[PDB]
Structure 1
Amino acid sequence: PYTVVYFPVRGRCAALRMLLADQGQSWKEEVVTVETWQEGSLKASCLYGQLPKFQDGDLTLYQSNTILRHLGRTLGLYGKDQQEAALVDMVNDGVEDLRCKYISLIYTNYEAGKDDYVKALPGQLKPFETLLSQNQGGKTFIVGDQISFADYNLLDLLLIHEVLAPGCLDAFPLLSAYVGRLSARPKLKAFLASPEYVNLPINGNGKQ
């Protein structure tokens, strides 16, 4: 089945877990403690010396976006055709770009950079609002009319930014409604409310 190996944080595993939960999939969580990591053996066995590590049967995967695409491909959350698949990738790459900036802020200079970051935020979120506006008025998903792995990734990005800059989605009605709508999906709603998700810190350094 599935096994996700990661630190005890939401971080880069938040989206794929939301995906797994919402899709009614069962998975095992192998928590890696900072002590176990600093020991060296696991790190060395990891392709790029990092987590998340994912196992699907004897297929071992590394890289959060690789796991998302893999699950999207095998579970049918990758568009209805090649054109949609490309748009899904375009959205995910955009999400990843902002996530990189967010991770940098959180870990390198949260203190001095938070203000400029939050100021620049609207311009960073605008593209997703625009995408929504061009797809059935933003009433369905980020691409097409079926959920895709990019939806889960974008949802997580929006959720963590609401914690970082409360009200950042107020100026974006489509994104706002989008978060509410997806967060309401039964299995996902249950998962988001569960201790498994709620009792995990967003990041590893206590900042958010």
Structure 2
Amino acid sequence: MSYKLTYFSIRGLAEPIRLFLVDQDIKFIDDRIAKDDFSSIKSQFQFGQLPCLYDGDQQIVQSGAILRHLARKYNLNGENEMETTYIDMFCEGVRDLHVKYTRMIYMAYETEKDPYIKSILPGELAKFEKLLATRGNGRNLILGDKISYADYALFEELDVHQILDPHCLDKFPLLKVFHQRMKDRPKLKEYCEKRDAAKVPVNGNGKQ
């Protein structure tokens, strides 16, 4: 196949890209590497890291650049400049939350999980609840009736946070409904069921 996505055998940074491809029914090689095999191939990647998307003869690293490239190719980058900017801004906010999440996961899970759930996460989710409402009253997708790459990133971030704290979206009905809407899309429903059956690790250290 012409698309190949190389990453570790976890959800991590690649999962929104996987979700984009699965939902759009773009067939790809999901190339999942063992942690010990990475050293021998790391020099092949431009910053020594994954994920990497091979798109025909093009080798593209950096998850955000991969997503935006696919978005342009498949018309999921908004319909005008303002929409393009908005989904970019939204998606960058999602990345900020993921940074806070991964710092807690990898550096301080045993002591910072509880405080993160109680004192950090609610205020961060509230920013998205308010933002999501700006188009289509937040009752469909980030841009309203048309899907964009930012929807896959937000879906994943809400999903991993619900694993972490099953009740984190209780006070956020728009985010809760958005999450379920995205999970109900036929190709994602099937994919997420298989992902759960295999208990795919969210992170590289087994914590979630």
Judge same fold: TM > 0.5, yes or no: yes
- Following superposition, the deviation at residue 17 of structure 1 comes to 0.7
Letter in 2 for 1:7: F
CA deviations over 1:105-135 (Å, ceiling 9, x no partner): 1101111111221121110011111112222
Whole-Å separation in 2 of the counterparts to 1:25 and 1:133:
29
SS in 2 for 1:163: helix
- 3-state DSSP of counterpart to 1:6: strand
Matched residue, 2:133: 133
Counterpart residue number, 2:78 = 79
Q: Which residue of 2 aligns with 1:177?
A: 177
Q: How does 1:1-208 map to 2 (within 5 A)?
A: 1-37=2-38, 40-119=39-118, 120-195=120-195, 198-208=198-208
TM-score (norm: length of structure 2): 0.95
Distance 1:180 1:195, change over 3 A: closer
Q: Which of 185-194 and 171-180 deviates more?
A: 185-194
Query: Counterparts of 1:113 and 1:159 in 2: how far apart (Å)?
Result: 20
CA 1:198–1:76: 2 relative to 1, 3 Å: farther
8 Å CA contact 1:192–1:198 kept in 2: the answer is no
Unaligned runs of 5+ in 1: none
1:12 partner SS: coil
How far 1:143 sits from its partner (Å)? 2.4
How far did 1:7 drift?
0.9
**RMSD over aligned Cα, in angstroms?**
1.4
- Provide the secondary structure at the position in 2 that maps to 1:147: coil
Worse-superposed segment, 116-125 or 189-198: 189-198
Q: Segments of 4+ in structure 1 off by > 4 A?
A: 195-198
Contact 2:6–2:30 under 8 Å retained in 1: yes
Instruction: Give the deviation of 1:195 after TM superposition.
Output: 4.5
Report % sequence identity: 42
Q: How many residues align?
A: 206
Q: Distance between the aligned counterparts of 1:196 and 1:169, measured in 2?
A: 20
Contact 1:84 1:144 in 2 (8 A): no
CA distance change for structure 1 residues 84 and 144 in 2, over 3 Å: closer, same or farther?
A: farther
Return the alpha-carbon distance in structure 1 between the equivalents of residues 103 and 33 of structure 2: 22
Equivalent residue of 2:46, what SS? coil
**Cα gap change, 1:87 to 1:198, in 2 (>3 Å):** farther
| Residue identity in the other structure for 1:129 | E
Letter in 2 for 1:162: Q
Q: Distance in 1 between matches of 2:12 and 2:35?
A: 15
Separation in structure 2 between the aligned mates of residue 199 and residue 67 of structure 1, nearest angstrom: 25
Return 5+ residue gaps in structure 2 as ranges: none
What are the Cα deviations for residues 45-91 of structure 1, in whole angstroms up to 9, with x where unaligned?
21111111110001101111111111111111111111000000000
